[PDB]
Amino acid sequence: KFKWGKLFSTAKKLYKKGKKLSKNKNFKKALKFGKQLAKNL
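Structure tokens predicted for Spiderine-1a:
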């Protein structure tokens, strides 16, 4: 008797959004950012 669809929808949305927004040009920035950050060592 719980609204599982709420959590499922929310999570699913964030995931789909993140991916779609990731495959975009944002990937470049995200990549460089992480890379450089790890380069510091």
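Residues 1-41 form one domain.
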